[PDB]
Amino acid sequence: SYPIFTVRWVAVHTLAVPTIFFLGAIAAMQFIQR
């Protein structure tokens, strides 16, 4: 019925995949001690 991989899929994932990666990175940064 509905196609799976579209332009909208590409835009959504190009925004969302680095967002989750960066969120994990900053969450790890919260436990860094000097």
Binding site: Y2, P3, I20, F21, G24, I26, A27, M29, R34
Partner: protein, 81 residues
């Protein structure tokens, strides 16, 4: 109304969460390990908390030449700061 499955229909499907309960934690863990292993410091050249200064130095490693700026940064890094 443009030819795609509505976002509400997608994110309420079981198959979406079957995929994404794997993919989303994998990306989160990948970012966490990118920071915690110290790969971010090496990739982006960000000083570690023990790496802003040399032990007795209080001067700031500021680049002063345009075409030797890379060499100046490498000299500053080689100064054990």
């Amino acid at each position: 109304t443009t030819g795609e499955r509505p976002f509400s229909d997608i994110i309420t499907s079981v198959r979406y969460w079957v995929i994404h309960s794997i993919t989303i934690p994998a990306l989160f863990i990948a970012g966490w390990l990118f920071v915690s292993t110290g790969l971010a410091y090496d990739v982006f050249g960000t000083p570690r908390p023990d790496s802003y200064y040399a032990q007795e130095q209080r001067s700031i490693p500021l680049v002063t030449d345009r075409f030797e700026a890379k060499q100046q940064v490498e000299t500053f890094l080689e100064q054990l700061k």
